[PDB]
Scaffold this active site. Structure first.
Site, short mmCIF file in Angstrom:
data_model
loop_
_atom_site.label_atom_id
_atom_site.label_comp_id
_atom_site.label_asym_id
_atom_site.label_seq_id
_atom_site.Cartn_x
_atom_site.Cartn_y
_atom_site.Cartn_z
N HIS A 124 -6.75 3.89 11.09
CA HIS A 124 -5.78 3.38 10.11
C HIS A 124 -6.40 2.27 9.27
O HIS A 124 -6.18 1.08 9.49
CB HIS A 124 -4.44 3.00 10.75
CG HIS A 124 -3.38 2.65 9.72
ND1 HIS A 124 -2.35 3.54 9.33
CD2 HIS A 124 -3.19 1.54 8.97
CE1 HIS A 124 -1.64 2.99 8.36
NE2 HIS A 124 -2.13 1.78 8.13
N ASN B 283 0.83 -1.18 0.00
CA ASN B 283 0.00 0.00 0.00
C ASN B 283 0.88 1.24 0.00
O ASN B 283 0.51 2.24 0.58
CB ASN B 283 -0.95 0.01 1.20
CG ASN B 283 -1.48 -1.38 1.57
OD1 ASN B 283 -2.23 -1.97 0.81
ND2 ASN B 283 -1.04 -1.93 2.70
N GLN C 290 -1.97 1.70 18.58
CA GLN C 290 -2.93 1.36 17.56
C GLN C 290 -3.33 -0.07 17.74
O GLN C 290 -2.45 -0.92 17.68
CB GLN C 290 -2.28 1.42 16.19
CG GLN C 290 -2.68 2.68 15.40
CD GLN C 290 -2.15 2.79 13.98
OE1 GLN C 290 -1.57 3.80 13.60
NE2 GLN C 290 -2.46 1.82 13.16
N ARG D 161 4.42 6.95 11.46
CA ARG D 161 4.02 6.23 12.67
C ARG D 161 3.63 7.19 13.80
O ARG D 161 4.28 8.16 14.04
CB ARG D 161 5.15 5.27 13.08
CG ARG D 161 5.67 4.37 11.98
CD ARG D 161 5.38 2.95 12.36
NE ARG D 161 5.80 1.94 11.38
CZ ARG D 161 5.46 1.93 10.07
NH1 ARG D 161 4.83 2.94 9.52
NH2 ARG D 161 5.81 0.92 9.31
#
Ligand code: NAD
Lengths: 331, 327
Positions: free
Chosen positions: B286, B105, B267, B238
């Site tokens: 995300h 991605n 996360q 990040r």
């Protein structure tokens, strides 16, 4: 000469905005320095009426227009020049303006880039399903199935540009590097381009993954994307219209979203404007509307300020405008 | 082989699904394997499963406890990237292969970041609130609405994604500048620049760097205030690169006009993460790993692994977390 302006109301704190009642795009001094009367209306209608008898020149932006209907024009025996602070004069009865020999001019060029940016942003927000991603962010959530469900890469999609003029072309340039097939339709710009393949309208409508509109509001684009056209567009496609509200049938576009023929609609242009508080485009499924400022970015404001100024200069001494700028011609 | 998959219940042309299951139904029963889709109270299945499959955002946990009970399992596939959920130590010792689908991605992330720049500078959030809200200010939204054009944009970290972001930013007629520990030559596209200078000269900064000990907390209270007034920060690299709490101070004080990005500390973001509620954010959760064609990618990969495994072929090392006998 008496110059009347309608601009959005200034707000305490918002010391940035150029196009409002306080900073009024610099005209107060610019005008009152040249012998002229300058009237900013915080009025719209009713306080407009008490100036019609004597206004020499009216000024407003498409984002917040002073409508010059036949009714109002006939009341204005002094009026010679209707300046659109921006681009888009559909707020003025051109037919009547013509017949009374009022000139109509907008600031061609002044916000083309802005509008391109807004459109590609809309493509992105739409395909990437930013809206869902942000809602979940905001609302305490974290659920990848439901965001995922409508989230697409823009890359590899086919984008149809309806109207391949200045803004259509600016949009191609910025879309090219995202690795995407471009098609366009334009009456005239019907050659292949370095960036886009010419295509018929039929074909644009049916083959495009999503479509962005960069066409003027002419008798042909009036209500063009009605039930029928929406219907013919790919299932699950997207539509972006930062050109003019009326090209897209208010009601048809709702039925298209609610039924989920159309995956999403964005844009910043409305019928009418200002958008009434309950305009169904505000509340409708999977929309990324904004109110109409895309051509009113801060930088866009300088460009507009400088145009309105240049126009008024030429006007006041019988210098002929750049053709760019003339909607209705006058003697 | 008997192949087990855990996916979420449907609700939704999502692929990672009890309904669509990345196409494994016919794919498998068309080469004669058993296919079982599910909750993790199918322990009631692990005596004999040949292959388990799950996605990282809804794992079937392969604990040592459960692996010991699972004596026939040869292959744990992660539909996605991240095998936290599998005890690699035990995997290794019972000679289960653990494999991942390195779905790629880079482009996604670049698009996302570019969109964040747009949403931030053009004042889309306010523009949209007014819409939905039934207002029509114009001083309000115009007051902080900018063209991306002519702005100077600083890219912190000039790898694949930075570069991918540059190419997309180029035709918007902005000045690009970057800092990189390695690409410290001018790039036909971005001017190399010291980090100091990146921080202080950029209109908006986008972070495209890896989480290393020198990027850990690099965007703390000091760097945030070294950034100009009313600038913008976008971070899809990040979360811990940016000091959680410093940044909230930086918006609240209006030193920063805006912040967007889709990466968090930690996360998944806790439900009360302050970055959710903070002023003038354009955060998303995300997903991005999550786009529909990220799913097609995974689909194809889980299939390609299973096919390989079946015809006993070799694998890409990139895909093997724990290697094992076949593998
Ligand atoms: N949102 C904003 O703030 C804002 C600002 C500027 C312009 N706009 C709108 O965006 C549109 C694009 O502006 P532009 O500068 O590119 O103008 P342009 O004249 O460069 O683009 C219009 C092009 O569309 C083509 N066209 C004409 N009739 C058509 C039809 N029937 N079907 C399809 N295409 C047709 C023409 O060949 C023309 O070249 C304008 O109509 C304008 O009102 C909105």
């Amino acid at each position: 000469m008496k110059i009347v302006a309608l601009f959005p109301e200034a707000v305490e704190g918002q010391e940035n905005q150029l196009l409002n009642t306080k900073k009024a795009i610099g005209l107060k001094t610019f005008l009152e320095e040249r012998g002229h009367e300058f009237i900013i209306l915080a009025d719209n209608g009713e306080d407009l009426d008490k100036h019609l008898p004597d206004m020499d020149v009216i000024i407003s932006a498409p984002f917040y227009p002073a409508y010059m209907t036949r009714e109002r024009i006939e009341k204005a025996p002094n009026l010679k020049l209707a300046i659109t602070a921006g681009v888009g004069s559909d707020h003025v009865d051109l037919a009547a303006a013509s017949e009374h020999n009022i000139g109509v001019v907008e600031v061609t060029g002044s916000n083309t880039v802005s509008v391109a940016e807004h459109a590609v942003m809309d493509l992105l927000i739409l395909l990437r399903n930013y809206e869902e991603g942000h809602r979940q962010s905001v609302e305490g959530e974290w659920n990848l199935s439901q965001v995922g469900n409508h989230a697409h890469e823009l890359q590899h999609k086919t984008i149809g540009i309806f109207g391949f003029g200045r803004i259509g072309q600016l949009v191609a340039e910025r879309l090219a590097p995202f690795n995407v097939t471009l098609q366009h339709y334009d009456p005239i710009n019907q050659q292949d381009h370095k960036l886009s393949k010419f295509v018929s309208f039929d074909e644009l409508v049916s083959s495009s993954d999503a479509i962005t509109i960069h066409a003027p509001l002419t008798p042909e684009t009036d209500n063009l994307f009605d039930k029928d056209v929406l219907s013919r567009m790919k299932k699950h496609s997207y539509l972006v219209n930062t050109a003019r509200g009326k090209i897209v049938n208010r009601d048809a576009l709702v039925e298209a979203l609610a039924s989920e023929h159309l995956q999403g609609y964005a844009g910043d242009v409305w019928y009418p404007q200002p958008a009434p508080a309950d305009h169904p485009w505000r509340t409708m499924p999977r929309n990324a509307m904004t109110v109409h400022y895309s051509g009113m970015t801060l930088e866009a404001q300088k460009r507009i300020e400088d145009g309105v100024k240049d126009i008024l200069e030429r006007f006041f001494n019988h210098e002929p405008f750049q053709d760019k700028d003339i909607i209705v011609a006058s003697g």
